[PDB]
Design a protein around this nucleic acid. Structure first.
Ligand SMILES: [Mg+2]
Ligand SMILES: [Mg+2]
Ligand SMILES: [Mg+2]
Ligand SMILES: [Mg+2]
Ligand SMILES: [Mg+2]
Ligand SMILES: [Mg+2]
Ligand SMILES: [Mg+2]
Ligand SMILES: [Mg+2]
Ligand SMILES: [Mg+2]
Ligand SMILES: [Mg+2]
Ligand SMILES: [Mg+2]
Ligand SMILES: [Mg+2]
Ligand SMILES: [Mg+2]
Ligand SMILES: [Mg+2]
Ligand SMILES: [Mg+2]
Ligand SMILES: [Mg+2]
Ligand SMILES: [Mg+2]
Ligand SMILES: [Mg+2]
Ligand SMILES: [Mg+2]
Ligand SMILES: [Mg+2]
Ligand SMILES: [Mg+2]
Ligand SMILES: [Mg+2]
Ligand SMILES: [Mg+2]
Ligand SMILES: [Mg+2]
Ligand SMILES: [Mg+2]
Ligand SMILES: [Mg+2]
Ligand SMILES: [Mg+2]
Ligand SMILES: [Mg+2]
Ligand SMILES: [Mg+2]
Lengths: 209, 120, 56, 114, 121
RNA sequence: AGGACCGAACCGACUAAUGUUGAAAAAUUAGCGGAUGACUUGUGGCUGGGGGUGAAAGGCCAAUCAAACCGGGAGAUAGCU
RNA sequence: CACAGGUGGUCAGGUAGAGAAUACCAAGGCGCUUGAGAGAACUCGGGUGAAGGAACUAGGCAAAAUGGUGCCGUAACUUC
RNA sequence: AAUUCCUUGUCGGGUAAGUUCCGACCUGCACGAAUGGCGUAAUGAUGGCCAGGCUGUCUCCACCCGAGACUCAGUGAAAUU
RNA sequence: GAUGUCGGCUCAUCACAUCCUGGGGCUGAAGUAGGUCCCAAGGGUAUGGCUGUUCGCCAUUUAAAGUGGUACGCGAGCUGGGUUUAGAACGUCGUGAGACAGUUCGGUCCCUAUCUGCCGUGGGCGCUGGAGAACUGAGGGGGGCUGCUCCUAGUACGAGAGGACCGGAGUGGACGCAUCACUGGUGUUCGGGUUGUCAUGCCAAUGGCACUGCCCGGUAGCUAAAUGCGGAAGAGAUAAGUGCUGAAAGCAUCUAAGCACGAAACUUGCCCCGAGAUGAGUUCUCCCUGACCCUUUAAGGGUCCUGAAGGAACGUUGAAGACGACGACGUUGAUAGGCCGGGUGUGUAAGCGCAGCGAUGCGUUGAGCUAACCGGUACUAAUGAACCGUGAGGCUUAACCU
């Protein structure tokens, strides 16, 4: 099937009759007003666009209004495609919701990331640290040898070393659903998904069983 | 990574950011106006504001604990006995900051931290 | 670790391309006074968003 | 946030009584055992303390059969069942780790009493 | 719990200090605890007993200093690291009385001989 | 009493790091040994180069030492580059 | 070099202290002739570290630790 | 053995495991009596080995405080080519 | 007119003559496990004692602890233990200076990166009207390991002992990604205790310095030892191998015609970058519809009036960040700080009273104080503007129009 665009604000418990304490992440799905559903009519697609929040309207650009109005416009943070197979949906504000899930138990969630910045090995690549003593010189926690010699005469592509860390897609997969309680539009999953509170994040039913 | 941290560390100890400030603090009271680095100003505010908020309640505690901060009775007096009630109604924003930046020596940005009701 | 071949003038300016500069990008004018000043911060002598914050 | 909390209190119990960092207390937890399932006691003495809403612990020192043991009770968990109060005392401290290395007589704590 | 390390005898025949020399379970298994099998090497031992200093049997951790926890997320920690000797080639404790408490994570049948033994949990 | 003991001044240099286009043509920092003695230091004097001096390392003799520095024989000689 | 080096003699306050140690202070003298921001990797100098405790390594290199006064009590061996 | 080539000699101790270490044997490749032999209390910034205590030495790195590094304004090098 | 040696460390990349896991032929293959050969490079492939060692011997693991190339990979990356300087001694040789493919104790490891190359990140211009977005997906990379236990079934097999296949379920080791809810670490911006001393006239109460003076606890954030998830199933085309039908060759025959199966390798499936994909793609929406003049005139050049959509700047800032960048907000306001209330954390302030000769204790008082947190609040700061971008978009031909 397809998924909905939620928001992060989770990380909590939920004790069980038996005694278990289930971790959690509270995704909030404020309805998904389809913005411009379209089939093969235009492009090999077969997906359905959406929206969820609410721009101040005073901020929305004029262009960011036409496409809107050319359907059941309802502002919202952004727009999100949602590929589907063998299914219908009205190009007009249909606003799908968490009801989507219930019998659903998969879920995946795909927030942005965490964004460290610097990175550098030891963290950016779990690189091991060469003894902070027994000699050593300005080379305790450093790359140390990023190649070989004349034969290769260069440094191979993909060589793990420093460079911006985090701040990108990173999905998760699996994660059993705990609550699909609407009325508040809450979706409780197993635990920890990228995000960073308030950060937007998809929540499609796990490709894997 | 600094993520969600607060308070500019400036360029010194944790002893400096508790003296060069405590001083400038009184220097603010003692003069009602001041020219300094926007960064420093956009900090002394977080310093000389919780002090005036404390000026509301006269008391003995609110005097010694107002003395704990700043070693100038001369100002712990201007507080509680002036700017105390002077802002007795003030919702909180007891200061304008103003700007101008660009100093002769350093191409440093200067501001103009000052009390709101500074009309003299 | 030094160079092996004296860099051509070309390759030099090639690096200074970004090492350019930017103007004032147009500056503000005060309401009260016809002050020709820098946005968001004090005019030639005490004026700003009207008012007269700081005399002299 | 306020969607949360309402989610928190939604599970917070009001059975947990007065709590001080130094009391003896006696927690009763469902053992679950094997085929059976009862309630196991744990008379102790507080040494550290929760205070985080739905999220909270006990951290108790026992010194049972032979040597000492520590147990941080997630309070609001069904396993908690019921927690006593027993002897209360005087500590003049928030966390009593200075009790780790102590042993009887030296580990002795005072009594509260108003 | 990791190579080296010194655990105590939670039963008898070969007292105190006993050093771990191998964490069993798989290639590169870092540390062990709760109730796993670990290669041991007697270091002190009581004069008598059936086992003596120098021996190299294996044992099961019984009381780590770190602790254990699950369900509610409540941690049960001890102050010291417990052990328990068992005849090497084919399981079950080479002893009689098991001194001190234990954990229900040991109620895993194949250890039972120990949990039945009287102190606690 | 003591080429005695612990330890500052003072004398020295065993370890490590930092420095190595240095703050420095041998140092800084944390440590380290000696500290009434074959101790240490100020001023001035005497030993001169195949010579001096040396509790001896070819060590020192003005950032120079298996024969100082300066000038001269001198455009040494160079079947070598 | 307006250089973290070298340079002999004299003077010697208060509290704490065995003391020309050391800490804080007198008198007196200074903030070391680029500053302002940021709060990246990595380097230098430090503080704190769950469980383990030399498994490091050529080597416990470096760290960590010991550390005062009175009293108790103190082995092989010895040129006593 | 500061002497032993064969050599990680052989045996005993220490260790879970010891080409090092300690105790022996003697087959001294090639110890040996003032270019001294064998001992030796005390002393040693001396070589080797072991243990307690201790620990970020390490498993396995985490966080934090400062001086650089990064941005801005002024001054303004270097080897090499 | 210098191409730094061994071993180690850090980080690797390839080959396959494959150590483990995978698929097969033969077996002197009952099973269980083995032996040997063929196929197979996806992934994975030990810690310590001794020694400078690589290696090796030993101890204990493991599914296994592969083999080999890469200046016997890697010192403008670390070490300096082995090894060739200068000291010194032993054995030995030499009359001696000295010497040893003998040994022993000691013994300075430099370089701020221009070019290539890499890991990240921007600025230009271009994609033919200018803009704001949403995607297609050519391509590129990532990932790919495996133990054990229960079921099948104590069944097949076996005289027993012992003991499967095929398939199914669950739980781990190692590796990776993400996240602070839990358990903890830190937390020199929170609180408290305390030694020495200087000071705020003194009492009391406080502040400065002494590593944050020493120390106990700790918010947010960051984080692992903590917590959740993952490397699959399933497709397609094959490897070795196994076959059907069948002639060449009256038989036989996997092949010649023609069909069928078949592995972690290959193409996919799973995750991420991704139209500079110059072959620069597509979809949706938005904005501009005045004059004139000068030519060398059908190619254009300039002036007046206009300057939009959107951008950029600027300011307040961010779980975003070296700088750029990217995100939010700008009075049409929660975007920062302050403020109010709450929480959390310390732990019962000060002042006053009582008791005690006093140290101190008790009451007031779970008080006082409290950040990066939660809820809320325009008090202060986020100015009207100004800047850039223009004014209906080249030809040719074709499909529908007229
Ligand atoms: Mg060096
Ligand atoms: Mg090439
Ligand atoms: Mg903030
Ligand atoms: Mg600075
Ligand atoms: Mg301080
Ligand atoms: Mg002496
Ligand atoms: Mg020194
Ligand atoms: Mg001495
Ligand atoms: Mg003289
Ligand atoms: Mg000289
Ligand atoms: Mg001549
Ligand atoms: Mg000549
Ligand atoms: Mg100077
Ligand atoms: Mg630790
Ligand atoms: Mg070792
Ligand atoms: Mg090792
Ligand atoms: Mg040392
Ligand atoms: Mg130390
Ligand atoms: Mg011997
Ligand atoms: Mg001799
Ligand atoms: Mg003789
Ligand atoms: Mg092959
Ligand atoms: Mg080995
Ligand atoms: Mg050892
Ligand atoms: Mg090599
Ligand atoms: Mg080097
Ligand atoms: Mg060497
Ligand atoms: Mg010599
Ligand atoms: Mg001779």
């Amino acid at each position: 099937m397809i998924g909905l665009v939620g928001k992060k604000v989770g990380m909590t418990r939920i004790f069980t009759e038996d005694g278990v304490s289930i971790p959690v992440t509270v995704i909030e799905v404020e309805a998904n007003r389809v913005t411009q559903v379209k089939d093969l009519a235009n492009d090999g697609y077969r997906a359905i666009q959406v929206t969820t929040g609410a721009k101040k309207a005073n901020r929305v650009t004029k262009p960011e209004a036409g496409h809107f109005a050319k359907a059941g416009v309802e502002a919202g943070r952004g727009l999100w495609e949602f590929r589907l197979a063998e299914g219908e949906e009205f190009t007009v504000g249909q606003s799908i919701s968490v009801e989507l899930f219930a019998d659903v138990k998969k879920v995946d969630v795909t927030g942005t990331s965490k964004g460290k910045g610097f990175a550098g090995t030891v963290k950016r690549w779990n690189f091991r640290t060469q003894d902070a003593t027994h000699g050593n010189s300005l080379s305790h926690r450093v790359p140390g040898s990023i190649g070989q010699n004349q034969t290769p005469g260069k440094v191979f592509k993909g060589k793990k070393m420093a460079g911006q860390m985090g701040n990108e897609r990173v999905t998760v997969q699996s994660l059993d659903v705990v609550r699909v309680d609407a009325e508040r539009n809450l979706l409780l999953v197993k635990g920890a998904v990228p995000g960073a509170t308030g950060s937007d994040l998809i929540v499609k039913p796990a490709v894997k069983a | 990574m600094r993520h969600r941290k607060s308070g500019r560390q400036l360029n010194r100890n944790s002893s400096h950011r508790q003296a060069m400030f405590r001083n400038m603090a009184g220097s603010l009271v003692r003069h009602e106006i001041i020219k300094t680095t926007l960064p420093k100003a956009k900090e002394l505010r977080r310093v000389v504001e919780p002090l005036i908020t404390l000026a509301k309640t006269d008391s003995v505690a609110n005097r010694r604990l107002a003395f704990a901060r700043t070693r100038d009775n001369e100002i712990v007096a201007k507080l509680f006995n002036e700017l105390g009630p002077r802002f007795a109604s003030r919702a909180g924003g007891y200061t304008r900051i103003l700007k101008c930046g660009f100093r002769a020596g350093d191409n440093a940005p200067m501001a103009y931290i000052e009390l709101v009701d500074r009309s003299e | 670790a030094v160079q092996q071949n004296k860099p051509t003038r070309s390759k030099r300016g090639m690096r200074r391309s970004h090492d350019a500069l930017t103007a004032v990008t147009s500056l503000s004018v005060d309401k009260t006074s016809g002050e020709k000043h820098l946005r968001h911060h004090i005019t030639a002598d005490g004026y700003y968003r009207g008012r007269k914050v700081i005399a002299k | 946030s306020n969607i949360i909390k309402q989610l928190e209190q939604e599970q917070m119990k009001q059975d947990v009584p007065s709590f001080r960092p130094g009391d003896t207390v006696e927690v009763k937890v469902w053992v679950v055992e094997g085929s059976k399932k009862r309630l196991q006691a744990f008379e102790g003495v507080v040494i550290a303390i929760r205070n985080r809403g739905l999220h909270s612990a006990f951290t108790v020192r026992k010194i049972s059969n032979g040597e000492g043991v520590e147990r941080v009770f997630q309070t609001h968990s069904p396993v908690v069942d019921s927690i006593s109060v027993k002897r209360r005392g005087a500590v003049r401290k928030a966390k009593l780790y200075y009790l780790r290395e102590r042993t009887g007589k030296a580990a002795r704590i005072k009594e509260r009493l108003n | 719990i990791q190579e080296q390390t010194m655990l105590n005898v939670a039963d008898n025949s070969g007292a105190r200090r006993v050093m771990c020399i191998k964490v069993l379970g798989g290639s590169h298994r870092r540390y062990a605890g709760v109730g796993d099998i670990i290669k041991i090497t007697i270091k002190e031992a009581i004069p008598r007993g059936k086992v003596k200093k120098g021996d190299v049997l294996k044992a099961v951790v019984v009381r780590t200093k770190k602790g254990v926890r699950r369900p509610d997320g409540s941690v049960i920690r001890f102050d010291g690291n417990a052990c328990v000797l068992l005849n090497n080639n084919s399981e079950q404790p080479i002893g009689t009385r098991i001194f001190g408490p234990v954990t229900r994570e040991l109620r895993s049948e194949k250890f039972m001989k120990i949990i039945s033994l009287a102190p606690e949990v």
